[PDB]
Scaffold this motif. Structure first.
Motif, PDB file in Angstrom:
ATOM      1  N   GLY A   1       0.717  -1.263   0.000  1.00  0.00           N
ATOM      2  CA  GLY A   1       0.000   0.000   0.000  1.00  0.00           C
ATOM      3  C   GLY A   1       0.750   1.322   0.000  1.00  0.00           C
ATOM      4  N   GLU A   2       1.685   1.512   0.932  1.00  0.00           N
ATOM      5  CA  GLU A   2       2.407   2.786   1.024  1.00  0.00           C
ATOM      6  C   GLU A   2       3.667   2.965   0.192  1.00  0.00           C
ATOM      7  OE1 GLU A   2       1.667   5.928   3.185  1.00  0.00           O
ATOM      8  OE2 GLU A   2      -0.263   5.041   2.586  1.00  0.00           O
ATOM      9  N   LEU A   3       4.101   1.920  -0.502  1.00  0.00           N
ATOM     10  CA  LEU A   3       5.277   2.039  -1.362  1.00  0.00           C
ATOM     11  C   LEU A   3       5.045   3.210  -2.332  1.00  0.00           C
ATOM     12  CD1 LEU A   3       5.631  -1.710  -2.331  1.00  0.00           C
ATOM     13  CD2 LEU A   3       7.340  -0.463  -1.021  1.00  0.00           C
TER      14      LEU A   3
ATOM     15  N   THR B   1       1.731   7.152  -3.239  1.00  0.00           N
ATOM     16  CA  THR B   1       1.761   5.736  -2.915  1.00  0.00           C
ATOM     17  C   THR B   1       1.052   4.897  -3.973  1.00  0.00           C
ATOM     18  OG1 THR B   1      -0.306   5.847  -1.650  1.00  0.00           O
ATOM     19  CG2 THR B   1       1.744   6.222  -0.446  1.00  0.00           C
ATOM     20  N   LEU B   2       1.124   3.581  -3.813  1.00  0.00           N
ATOM     21  CA  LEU B   2       0.482   2.665  -4.734  1.00  0.00           C
ATOM     22  C   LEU B   2      -1.026   2.758  -4.577  1.00  0.00           C
ATOM     23  CD1 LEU B   2       0.299   0.113  -6.589  1.00  0.00           C
ATOM     24  CD2 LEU B   2       0.622  -1.230  -4.528  1.00  0.00           C
ATOM     25  N   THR B   3      -1.480   3.029  -3.358  1.00  0.00           N
ATOM     26  CA  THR B   3      -2.914   3.122  -3.117  1.00  0.00           C
ATOM     27  C   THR B   3      -3.485   4.411  -3.698  1.00  0.00           C
ATOM     28  OG1 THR B   3      -3.077   1.635  -1.196  1.00  0.00           O
ATOM     29  CG2 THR B   3      -4.667   3.417  -1.313  1.00  0.00           C
TER      30      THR B   3
ATOM     31  N   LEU C   1      -2.154   6.124  -6.357  1.00  0.00           N
ATOM     32  CA  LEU C   1      -2.107   5.955  -7.804  1.00  0.00           C
ATOM     33  C   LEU C   1      -3.312   5.121  -8.201  1.00  0.00           C
ATOM     34  CD1 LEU C   1       1.687   5.057  -8.120  1.00  0.00           C
ATOM     35  CD2 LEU C   1       0.591   7.165  -9.011  1.00  0.00           C
ATOM     36  N   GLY C   2      -3.603   4.106  -7.399  1.00  0.00           N
ATOM     37  CA  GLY C   2      -4.733   3.248  -7.679  1.00  0.00           C
ATOM     38  C   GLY C   2      -6.024   4.029  -7.822  1.00  0.00           C
TER      39      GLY C   2
ATOM     40  N   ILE D   1      -3.242   1.871 -13.402  1.00  0.00           N
ATOM     41  CA  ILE D   1      -1.984   2.454 -12.952  1.00  0.00           C
ATOM     42  C   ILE D   1      -0.976   2.284 -14.080  1.00  0.00           C
ATOM     43  CG2 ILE D   1      -0.120   2.360 -11.301  1.00  0.00           C
ATOM     44  CD1 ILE D   1      -1.994   0.964  -9.363  1.00  0.00           C
TER      45      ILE D   1
END
Ligand code: FE2
Ligand code: FE2
Ligand code: FE2
Ligand code: FE2
Lengths: 193, 193, 192, 192
Positions: free
Chosen positions: A44-46, D47-49, D51-52, D62
């Protein structure tokens, strides 16, 4: 979900290229204990730059390491009612030249961008060429007449599209348009796909 | 041209799989003198069943051995004027139920089939479900109201699409429609892509 | 079948573009009964030039109207024994320079062309040179030392010892022989 | 760059869907100055979340918003020497069963994973069995005799002598060891 997708795809890529949590963790510079967690759904936070590296060391793209857009359909369909259309205006020095009315869009087909374009300028010279789209385009004249321009922004081909005319614009092909000279306004449906 | 495309692609495939005119000619059962000619542009009269074999022995499809659809564009665009639209009618016991008005189409994008559909039936029960398309579909209501049906031909979901509504139908998703009950007729733009 | 495959695909394309037997027949200068026959599996004798025009009026390609390569697998797999492998000789003046051993191939992936290439020339200047293909290529040195040449006759050169592997992108032209005076080398090349 | 790549791709997607800085910002619960910064190369910490969700509101993925793998070639090619190759051990109880030698790999084709697999087990019953992958696979027997098992634990079996080659379609599960009591075998497997 974006975290769960990353987990499954990180693990799969790691496995297909024969790297244990150890090697990947080293090669990247983390603790095997960390990569393990990433694959446990804890990514998640990467950050975008961190994912940038992770994808590098695995000889791939962040795209291959993240899940697909998603599914927003209801039994294979999605319906947009006219009262929920997003509206954007192309204004110049505070005056409307274009109004884009956004039609139904779906994640199951991201290249699909359908618009109803109200052209509020009937002066061909106001036509401002736009580079070109990275996808093909289907056009349909709803009302009025459209003065279409295409090709060399400097020396371009021209067409007078009366109501009912349909057009196809190959991708990366530059184009621009206004309503026919002195007719006030026009309407066309544009579908970028 | 179809003969010239076959020539270049036959030769290329023959070479990529390491077969001299000799082997290919034998394996197929012809004279090396023949395959030679085929590659000289002389394939014109070969039949669909003969091409069927030739593609087999080369572990491929006739598609890989024939040239692509072609290019019918003019600087990346093609324009269809309303007076040149082909028209087809969906008639039942000699009465028009639908009229399809075919819009611009192009070989540079064969999946693109845009239509203006005049629905001349306002009785929902006349809606006849059609299996589903092998491609996605974008719909837009031009006039009237449309009673759309989709899913199980037996037990289906229904929607009342007022003018201006846009819809997305995933491929292979079965659908059918008429104009809203008692309103006479409706008009929608359908773009299969 | 090519015939049946055509039949099914033609009907779909026609219905897809709102053409009835007659409309299609008109554009083709044919009769509607003819076309109907085609959609009834009787297109077998149609020539390549005719199909070309049929596809043209249907605004698509012959390929879009013909069936896929087919399936030769067996529960997702196909096996070739060293005995059942074709052999082609790259000969010059009766002098064998290259001998290609064709490995397993499948319709399910036409683009895959795996080969064991015995290079019987240790004279680098004999390196012929092709103009790259519309596919990627993976190489691995089995025996000997390979003399790789890429870019274009005018070019980067690499001496690949045994166990070396390389990737050659599509359309990138290449050529090779065995290292100077070492007699011969062997490499497996898989085009995909 | 991931940052620059995002920046360029975000602006295009936004302009593509007729959203201005504010419209996007509204849906994201962000401020328009933030978004503008992102399109100015300052998205690195997203973060990846996040961007999601950005991708979600832009009705895409993404991946469609991030740059391609990149290019590691050199005039269409990349070369790996036997020295520069990673080695992974498929170990059980400290007992080496499989040892994989990683051959040349490239971003220009991420899906390509070539391997030299030394199988140190001649006990067919040791055949572990995987559940197939989302890629095709080509195999070639280098040394020894391979014991192939495909379909699914319950399965067709083949004893591949040296020089044998096989094609395994995607998602088709497989497993293998060296022929009964022959000690060990070697095969090169190229997943693409
Ligand atoms: Fe456009
Ligand atoms: Fe439809
Ligand atoms: Fe090659
Ligand atoms: Fe495998």
């Amino acid at each position: 979900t974006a975290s769960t997708g990353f987990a499954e795809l990180l693990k799969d890529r790691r496995e297909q290229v024969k790297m244990d949590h150890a090697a990947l963790a080293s090669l990247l510079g983390e603790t095997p204990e960390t990569v393990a967690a990433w694959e446990n759904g804890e990514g998640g936070e990467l950050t975008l730059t961190q994912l940038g590296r992770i994808a590098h060391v695995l000889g791939t793209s962040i795209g291959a390491l993240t899940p697909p857009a998603g599914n927003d359909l209801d039994d294979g369909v999605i319906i947009q009612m006219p009262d929920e259309r997003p509206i954007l205006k192309g204004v110049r020095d505070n005056v409307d030249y274009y109004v884009y009315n956004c039609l139904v869009r779906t994640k199951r087909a991201p290249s699909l961008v359908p618009l109803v374009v109200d052209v509020l300028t009937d002066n061909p010279d106001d036509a401002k060429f736009n580079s070109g789209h990275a996808g093909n385009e289907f056009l349909f004249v709803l009302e009025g007449e459209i003065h279409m321009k295409w090709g060399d922004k400097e020396n371009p081909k021209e067409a007078l599209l009366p109501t009912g005319a349909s057009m196809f614009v190959e991708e990366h092909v530059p184009h621009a348009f206004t309503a026919a000279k002195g007719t006030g306004s026009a309407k066309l449906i544009a579908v970028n796909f």
